[PDB]
Every structure is written in structure tokens, then in C-alpha cells.
Amino acid sequence: ASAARRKEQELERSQEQALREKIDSVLLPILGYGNYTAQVDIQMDFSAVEQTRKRFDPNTPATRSEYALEDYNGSVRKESTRNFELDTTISHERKQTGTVARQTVSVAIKDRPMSESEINAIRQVLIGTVGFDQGRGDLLNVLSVKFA
Amino acid sequence: ASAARRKEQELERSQEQALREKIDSVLLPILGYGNYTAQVDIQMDFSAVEQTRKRFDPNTPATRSEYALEDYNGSVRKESTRNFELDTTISHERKQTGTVARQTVSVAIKDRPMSESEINAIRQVLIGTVGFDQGRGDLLNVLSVKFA
Amino acid sequence: ASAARRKEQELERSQEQALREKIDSVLLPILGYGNYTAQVDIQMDFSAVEQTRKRFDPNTPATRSEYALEDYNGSVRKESTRNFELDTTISHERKQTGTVARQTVSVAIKDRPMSESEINAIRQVLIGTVGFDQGRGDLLNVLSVKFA
Amino acid sequence: ASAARRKEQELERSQEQALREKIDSVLLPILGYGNYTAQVDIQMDFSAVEQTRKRFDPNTPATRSEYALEDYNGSVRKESTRNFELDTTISHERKQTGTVARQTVSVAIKDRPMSESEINAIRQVLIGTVGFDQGRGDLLNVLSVKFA
């Protein structure tokens, strides 16, 4: 199984490399060659979830058989027996093993600095270039630093 | 199964490449060569959902057999027994494995900037060029940036 | 099994080496050659967790059969029998063996010192370069020291 | 099964290509060569729905056997037993796997702009050229843009 773990590491590294390639394909025309640096971290879960759900519909029952005895005298006896049929959904789901659980991307732009408007524009391009998903916990940093 | 995961990555990359090709086929005449850059992120779910639904119709029962005893004296006894037949739908669905769960497209247009009207027109063309589906969670960014 | 433990050590060292390579790929342009030193510690758990969860939904029961006797005279007798159907989820999860449980990264920058703003900018780049995850217990130190 | 998914992608692309060919066959005479650009997105569902419906007719029962006891004395006892026969429809449907769930078409017309009347006329021709189905969720954009 350790060979499987090794190949999982390979998958994660391949994903990171592909994302880096896309980042380059976007930023190389916009910024130029050597005016930026970017690295990508991709964390992938490899669990084996397998779920079975059996759901009913309480608010729409359908009476199948029914008995109702109601006699008076004073005495009032109200017996009743009822059998129901209910909407039944049975869903069996099997999640894919390796899923990107969190994605971190950081891009540093060489100074000569960059204005806030262009930094936010680059961030907007990256959002969509990488597939930024904040609800997944992903993080995207864009900074303007001084290259040596 | 890790080979299957590798081929799933290949499928996702192929989809992204096809969408990029369509984006180019639309924008190359409109904008020109080298006046734009665009990248596409496609996230695909590969679950194995398999659902079985059994639904009834509570509001239209059909009486199959019926017994009704109603005697008086004062004393009033009202016995009743009833059997019903109901509309029964049984649907077994099996979803396709790989489905595009979210799609992100970002396009950056070289300045010399672009007016808001033409930006929105390009966005309208892309909506339909790519098959934008906001209800799916898809995202489409169109920006006017300064190429270096 | 000790061979398996040896290969686990190899996996941990490989992960550390990959993270060091990424750190170099980010900092070598920004800082230069020989102006920094960085080391990475990665602790990986290799447990064999395997969980089975059976969850219900108490607040949405669906009555399947029902009996209700309610007679008066004074005397008031209220008998009742009820059978329910409940939403039932059965999920079997099998965690991946080797998972990064804690990650420690330390970077030391050669003086001639570095201002706090640039130190924090480098820290921001590293957050995303390495995939910093404070909730996991990870730690990232960036210091400005005097190289000999 | 991933080969099946690949061939599903091929089917979708083939459908898009055919629709593009029809769009060209309509617009090339009307507008000319190089005066327009159009792209088509086709999303196809590949579920495996298989439904069985058993429907009755509550409002037209036919009495098969009947017992009716009605004695008087005062005392009035009205016993009754009744058996019914009902109209029974049993339909088993099996949907075709790949069905176009949503269709998006966008057409951009080169300026020198186009009047609203001719834009709507082109839209009317396309509606029928492509088989526009708004109830399915399809979308058709026709814009007049400035080609570079």
C-alpha cells in the first residue's frame, strides 16, 4: 500500500505542476518573463467514503387500509387502526477517492511596486485561472515584492 | 484505482483544453492575435450515485373493498373497514459518473482600455460560447488589463 | 513490517525534500543565491482508521402503522400504539494511511537586517508556497539572522 | 467506464459541431464569409432513468360483488359489504441515456452596427435553425460587435 501512497504523492505533485503551468500561461503575457514568481500547494484527500441514505416523506402519507369504529351511548368510544404508505428514496453514493480538499496559491510580482487596482485585477484573473473556491478553504495571495 | 484517478485528471484537462479552443475560436476574430489571454478551470465530480424512488399519490385513492356497518337504537355504532389502491411510481435512476460540478473562466483583454459596453458584449458572447450556468456555481470574469 | 516503517521514513523525507524544493523555487529569485537558509519538518501519521457511522433523523418521523383507542364514560382511557420510519444514513469511511499531521517550516534570511514589512511579505508568499494550515498545528518561522 | 465517459464527451462535441455546421449553412449566405462568428455549447445528461407507473381511476369503480343487509324495528341496522374493480394502467418507461439537457448558442455579427429589426430577424431564423427550446433552459444570444 505504500506504493499506492507514493503514487498519491505523484498525483498531488502533478496537479500542482498543471496549476503552475496554467498560472504561467496566464501571467507570462501579462507581466513578462522573470517579473513574477508563483507556487501552488494542493492537498488531496484519499478517503473511501461510501454512503447509503434511506429517506422518507412524513408529510404526504397514503392510507392503504383503514378501520374506524365509533360508537356512542354518555359513553363515546373511538377506536381506529390505520396503515400507511410513504415516499421512499434509497440513494447509494460512492465518492471519488482523491479530491482536492484545499488549494493554496501565492504569486509575487517584482517591483519596478504595483498599484492596488492592478493587483486586484491580477487576482480577478487568477480567480478563474485556478478555479478559486473560498468555500472549500482555498487561499490566494498576491503580493508585490522586491526581487533581488 | 489510482490509474483511474489519473485518467479522471486527463478527462478534466481535456475538457479545459476544449473550452479554451472554443474561447480562442470566438475571440481570435473579434479581438485579434495576442490581444487577449484566457484560462479555464473545470472541476468534475466522479461520484457513483444510484437512487431508487418509490412515490405514491395520497390525494387520489381508489377503494378496492369496503365494509360499513351503521346501526342505531340513543346508541349509534358506526363501524367501517376500507382497503385502498394508490398510484405507485417506482423510478430507478443511475447518474453519470463524471459531471462538471463547477466551471470557472477568466479572460483578460489587452489595453490600448476597453469600454464597459464592449466588455459586456464580450461577456454576452462568452455566455453561450462556454455554456455559462450560474445556477451550477460557474463563474466568468472578463477584465481589461495592461499587457507588458 | 520494519521494512514498511523504513519506507514510511522515506516517504516523510521525500515530502520534506519536495517542500524544500518549492521553497527554493520561490525564494531563489526573490532573495538570491546564498542569502537564505530554510529547513522543513514533516510529521506524517500512518494509522489505519476505518469508521462506520449509522445516523438517524429524530425530528422527521413517518408513521407507518397506527392504532388509537379513545373511550369515555368520568373515565377517560386513551390507548395508542404507533410505528415509525426514520431517515437512515449509513456511511463507511476508510481514511488514507499516511497523512501530514503537522508541518514545521523555518526560514532564516541573511542580514545586510530586513524590515518587518518585507519579512511579513515573505511570510505571506510562503503561506501558499507551502500550504500553511494553522488549524492542523503547522508552524512557520521567518527570521532575519546574521550569516557568518 | 472512463472510456465510456470519453465517448460521451465525443458525442457532445459531435453535436456541437453539427449545430455549428447548420449555423454556418444558414448565416454564410445571409451575412457573408467572415462577417460573423458563432459558438455552441451543448450539455447532455447520461443518466439511466427507468420508471414504472401503476395508476388507477378512483372515480369510475365497477362493483363486482355486493352484500347489503338493512333491517328495521326504532332500531335501524344498515350493514354493507362491497368489492370493486378499477381501471388499472401499468406503464414501464425507459428513457434514452444521452439527452440534450441545455443548449447555449451565441452569435456575434461584425459591425459595418446592425439594426434591431435585422438582429431580431436573424434571431428568428436561428430559432428553428437550431431548434431553440426555452422551456428546456436553452439560451440564444445574438450581438453586434466590432471585429478587429
Binding site: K54, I90 | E50, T52, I90, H92 | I90, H92 | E50, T52
Partner: peptide, 17 residues
């Protein structure tokens, strides 16, 4: 386990219907 087997049997009932 037992619940998953019951789900599979329900799917088989769907197929038979």
C-alpha cells in the same frame, strides 16, 4: 453492511418493477 445490502435489494426491486 446490512443497511447497504437493503439499499441494493431496494434497487433490485426498482429494476424488477
Amino acid at each position: 453492511v446490512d443497511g447497504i445490502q437493503a439499499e441494493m435489494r431496494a434497487m433490485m426491486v426498482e429494476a424488477t418493477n
